[PDB]
Design a binder for this molecule. Structure first.
Ligand SMILES: [Cu+2]
Ligand SMILES: [Cu+2]
Ligand SMILES: [Cu+2]
Ligand SMILES: [Cu+2]
Ligand SMILES: [Cu+2]
Ligand SMILES: [Cu+2]
Ligand SMILES: [Cu+2]
Ligand SMILES: [Cu+2]
Ligand SMILES: [Cu+2]
Ligand SMILES: [Cu+2]
Ligand SMILES: [Cu+2]
Ligand SMILES: [Cu+2]
Ligand code: NI
Ligand code: NI
Ligand code: NI
Lengths: 270, 270, 270
């Protein structure tokens, strides 16, 4: 395993927007995609540049209670201070009892657990969230990578006319990481594209039973990811992604996946 | 692949009920079940017999932007007019990069994307939806087939005392296609019957891990299907299907699956 | 198969709390975990000790309409009376048509279907629910077993400060059975632990595609279960479990999974 040691900055970006970044002044919502391979360790020094108590907490990775990012376990970060969090991971292994301890690989995420409540309600509300991708040896890697977060009624905390436009060129391998947050229920749908409902979105063997889907529940705390080939079998153009809850899409949880020509040019019809 | 060429009519059935049909005056809610095998193409001339702008849009099948059924892509149908939509599909194939492009097979659906909003909110509300079943070579075929749509608080847009009664004879192979629509969350449950949670509802091989379930989330835009043997191991009788959200079932999202005797006669207890 | 014959008592425990128990005065919320192996039969004499009409109804097992626990099928229990319910199950078998009838194994549940409404709305509201675990030959068995029910805004009908603390020793095999009930949507999440999303939570073969997850939708009527090794790779301590819907966790759907030292002693940090 590789041990990586990074610094992340929690910053107030603007009114009611807080985010994580890899350099001072660099915070974004969603935060940076953090990538690991099974067995790797990530040591993160979280620098809290804000006037608020907040934290950093992951899903799916191995962390002990001192790294859990909760007030209860003394894992939060006071204003101006720095806390080291350690996230480990593992390849699968055989247990003494003969069962299999599964490797960490998956599309996971990280977020605030301390701001405004012991569940991080205000931190999550205001943007402290990002994707954590743990890969298995041999996995295919993307040309383009998009994080889509349905947070209450917002996509990536954008204003309601502002939903993110994600862009790829026809034929490129594109990875989507979907994360739900907040208090509302949602279904994430992508026009013109589909994926297998399993870890990677692609068939692992001849025996894989997983259904092909174009839509999946994305409720608070849930994450999943997949890869598609942009425009495969469907061509270039402006391809909608949206929450399929009708009241939600009508209020603006809908955005565009723009698939350009293979050469990067804008498709004629647009 | 087979290329089929059909005409579908969008019609106002009654006050606040719009549907699709395969012949003039023949519209139903839900609309006709459209069936394809992987590799087949369906060319649909949608005749809009109404005074409203509306469209036809699928999930899961290969369509280009000109067939997407959206206003944005110039794919809707003006009152009185006809639009040709083309839906393709494919068997699985090996990509140059060594991954597997999955075949289209699945329980999918189609609906309006243009009426009242660019998300088809009014069209879906009023009944323009139906099942689209794409089969894999070798799949088992049903004796009876039911489409169950949980649309907001309605089942198949029926009045609240009117939920559909579906009927089969003991021992028959019965296919259920479940579709969610609207703004509300639901869980679809069938008394006395169960299916494997995978594409077909049945074990694909000795290695299939899929759990056996009797209930599944059915939220807006989501579809799934399965087959069961009517009354298998449980006998004939009146077998409830319902949304398991308590407030919903109490307000009428519950209906009956009547399993008759093998010979079609009514079971004694009823 | 083993045929077991038991008596269960439906009792009013306190104001607005009704539960099932295996002996007079022994009712609990959730009720007792009932365990079967595929092929076993359970005959239950339900003694209704209350002043209310109520019933007992399962998911997943084979029962005929006379055992369905509904008023419609004459399956409820009048105050003071006793009704025999018969629940069967089966190992998988090959059908004449060549398909496979799947064995009953799964994490299922039972609850009231007759109290206050024909859907058992009041009975479920007030605590008549419990886990039903049907095992496959060869399955691993737990040292500790917890039933977690998200019922409307309550966990196991506890007062909002009272969410259950579940305890295990480091390294023990722990089984969780999760059940949703009521009218609200939820996502069940466990800090520091993870499981494969399939029947048992553990890899069934080299070909199992199932993703590793730490959180899953738990909506009304839905059940699932899994096993984990307490503190595996993460150590002992106080490990939160919670609904990840932010408004819910903040109002108290959160509780503790206390992982003690291997020897049963309290970890230092606590
Ligand atoms: Cu948490
Ligand atoms: Cu939504
Ligand atoms: Cu669509
Ligand atoms: Cu979380
Ligand atoms: Cu759409
Ligand atoms: Cu419902
Ligand atoms: Cu039931
Ligand atoms: Cu749709
Ligand atoms: Cu029921
Ligand atoms: Cu909840
Ligand atoms: Cu967590
Ligand atoms: Cu139930
Ligand atoms: Ni505006
Ligand atoms: Ni009425
Ligand atoms: Ni209080």
């Amino acid at each position: 395993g590789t041990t990586r040691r990074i610094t992340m900055y929690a910053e107030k970006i603007s009114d009611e927007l807080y985010g994580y970044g890899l350099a001072p002044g660099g915070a974004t919502v969603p935060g940076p995609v953090l990538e690991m391979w099974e067995g790797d360790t990530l040591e993160i020094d979280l620098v809290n540049t804000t006037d608020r108590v907040l934290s950093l907490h992951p899903h799916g990775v191995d962390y002990d209670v001192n790294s859990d990012g909760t007030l209860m376990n003394g894992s939060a970060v006071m204003p101006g201070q720095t806390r080291r969090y350690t996230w480990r991971s593992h390849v699968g292994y055989r247990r003494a009892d003969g069962s299999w301890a599964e490797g960490t690989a998956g599309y996971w995420h990280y977020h605030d657990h301390a701001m405004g409540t012991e569940h991080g309600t205000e931190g999550v509300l205001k943007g402290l969230y990002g994707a954590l991708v743990v890969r298995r040896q041999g996995d295919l890697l993307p040309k383009r990578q998009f994080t889509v977060v349905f947070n209450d009624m917002m996509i990536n905390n954008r204003a309601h006319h502002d939903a993110p436009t994600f862009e790829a060129n026809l034929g490129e391998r594109v990875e989507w990481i979907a994360i739900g947050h907040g208090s509302n229920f949602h279904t994430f749908h992508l026009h013109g594209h589909r994926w297998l409902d399993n870890r990677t979105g692609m068939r692992t063997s001849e025996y894989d039973p997983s259904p092909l889907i174009d839509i999946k529940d994305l409720n608070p705390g849930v994450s999943f990811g997949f890869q598609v080939i942009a425009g495969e079998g469907v061509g270039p153009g402006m391809w909608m992604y949206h929450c399929h809850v009708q009241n939600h899409s009508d209020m603006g949880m809908a955005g565009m996946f723009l698939v350009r020509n293979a050469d990067g040019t804008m498709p004629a019809g647009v």
